[PDB]
Structure 1
Amino acid sequence: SAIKPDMKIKLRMEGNVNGHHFVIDGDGTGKPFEGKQSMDLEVKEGGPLPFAFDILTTAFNRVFAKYPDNIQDYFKQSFPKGYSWERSLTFEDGGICNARNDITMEGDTFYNKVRFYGTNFPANGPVMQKKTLKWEPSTEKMYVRDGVLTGDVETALLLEGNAHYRCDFRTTYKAKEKGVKLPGAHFVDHCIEILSHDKDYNKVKLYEHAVAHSGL
């Protein structure tokens, strides 16, 4: 295996939400074979972000997912050359985002070139008013669409006041190396959490646990 039990994570995200530009750095560690990662994120430009930090967090790597032997692990098989993903996030109030990550590996470190663009969030909505509390735990449905590994998530942000704000994800995943075999359909359970933050989320410690399974 190219991938060690303990790996480092380096990340830079650039993006723009509703016209607000930002650059955010990340440094972290994770356990690919346990499906666990954490990272410290720091907003470098555009802070204090005028929208809910939560919309960005799933853009901050399915190599950090515990795969059983009976499911093809496309992500671990993609290394050392790496892979890329592109994601559409569609929110119930018309907010729409497009995100990308190009993931490479240099030695013991995954590098992440992340881009995040959002638009059409209502000025009065929970994203632009910073009323989100967290993503709920989710299940991603992995399958092949038009010959491309695709993951769908139907999820929601919990808001203040016992309300949810629905979002549907579709992610396409592509290994750099020609010939990495597509997996059969399966599920990946996710739980992403902000473990700690400072006043305006200019510093955030983010955690994710993910486990692949067949629904049994």
Structure 2
Amino acid sequence: SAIKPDMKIKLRMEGNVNGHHFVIDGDGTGKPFEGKQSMDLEVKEGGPLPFAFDILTTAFNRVFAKYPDNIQDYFKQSFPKGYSWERSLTFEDGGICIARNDITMEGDTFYNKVRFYGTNFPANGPVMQKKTLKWEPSTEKMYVRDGVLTGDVEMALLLEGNAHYRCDFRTTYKAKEKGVKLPGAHFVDHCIEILSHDKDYNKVKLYEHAVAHSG
């Protein structure tokens, strides 16, 4: 196995939300076979961010997901060459984001080149007013569409005032090496949490747990 039970994670994200530019670095570790990863993030440019940090967090690698023997593990089978993903986030108030990650591996470390672009958030909305609290746990549906592994999930951001703010995610996943076999349709249960932060979310510790299953 290319992938060891403990791996390091290095990341840089560049992006722009509603005209606001930012650069964010990450340094993390995780346990691919237990489906657990954590990361320390530090905003390097454009802080303090004028939008909810929460919109970014799922952009900060499905290799960290516990797969049973009876489902093909496309992600772990992608290494050492790696894979890329592309995601659209469609929020219920018209906000739209486009994100991508190109994932490589050198030794015991995954490198992630992330881009994140968002637009059309209303100035008076929960994202630009910083009113969000957390993503609710949920279930990604994995299937193949015209030869491309695709994951769909309807996600919910819990807002102050006990309301949710809904968002449809679609991610396409593609191995760098041709001939990695596609999996059959399945589910991935996942939960992402902000574990700690400083005053303006310039330094943040992030955690994700993810488990694949057949229903």
Q: What TM-score do the two structures reach when normalised by structure 1?
A: 0.99
Task: Return the alpha-carbon distance in structure 1 between the equivalents of residues 57 and 48 of structure 2.
Answer: 16
Question: Could you list the per-position Cα deviations for residues 122-144 of structure 1 after superposition, in whole angstroms to 9, with x for gaps in the alignment?
Answer: 00000000000000001000000
Matched, 1:98 2:104: no
Alignment length (residue pairs): 215
Q: How does 1:110-189 map to 2 (within 5 A)?
A: 110-189=110-189
Question: Could you list the per-position Cα deviations for residues 65-114 of structure 1 after superposition, in whole angstroms to 9, with x for gaps in the alignment?
Answer: 00000000000000000000000000000000000000000000000000
Task: Return the alpha-carbon distance in structure 1 between the equivalents of residues 51 and 146 of structure 2.
Answer: 34
| Identity within the alignment, % | 99
Q: Which ranges of structure 2 fall in alignment gaps of 5 or more residues?
A: none
Question: Could you list the per-position Cα deviations for residues 3-46 of structure 1 after superposition, in whole angstroms to 9, with x for gaps in the alignment?
Answer: 00000000000000000000000000000000000000000001
Task: Return the alpha-carbon distance in structure 1 between the equivalents of residues 161 and 29 of structure 2.
Answer: 34
RMSD: 0.3
Question: Could you list the per-position Cα deviations for residues 147-186 of structure 1 after superposition, in whole angstroms to 9, with x for gaps in the alignment?
Answer: 1000001011000010000000000000000000000000
Q: Which runs of 4+ in 1 moved over 3 A?
A: none
**Aligned to 1:21, what secondary structure does the other structure show?**
strand
Task: Return the alpha-carbon distance in structure 1 between the equivalents of residues 145 and 94 of structure 2.
Answer: 25
**Aligned to 1:57, what secondary structure does the other structure show?**
helix
The residue that corresponds to 2:70 in the other structure is 70
**Aligned to 2:59, what secondary structure does the other structure show?**
coil
Matched, 1:85 2:59: no
Task: Return the alpha-carbon distance in structure 2 between the equivalents of residues 183 and 123 of structure 1.
Answer: 42
Task: Return the alpha-carbon distance in structure 2 between the equivalents of residues 203 and 143 of structure 1.
Answer: 36
**Aligned to 1:54, what secondary structure does the other structure show?**
helix
Structure 1 residue 189: Cα displacement:
0.4
Structure 1 residue 49: Cα displacement:
0.2
Task: Return the alpha-carbon distance in structure 2 between the equivalents of residues 132 and 145 of structure 1.
Answer: 33
Task: Return the alpha-carbon distance in structure 1 between the equivalents of residues 125 and 36 of structure 2.
Answer: 32
Structure 1 residue 146: Cα displacement:
1.3
Q: Which ranges of structure 1 fall in alignment gaps of 5 or more residues?
A: none
Q: What TM-score do the two structures reach when normalised by structure 2?
A: 1.00
**Aligned to 2:58, what secondary structure does the other structure show?**
coil
Task: Return the alpha-carbon distance in structure 2 between the equivalents of residues 180 and 66 of structure 1.
Answer: 19
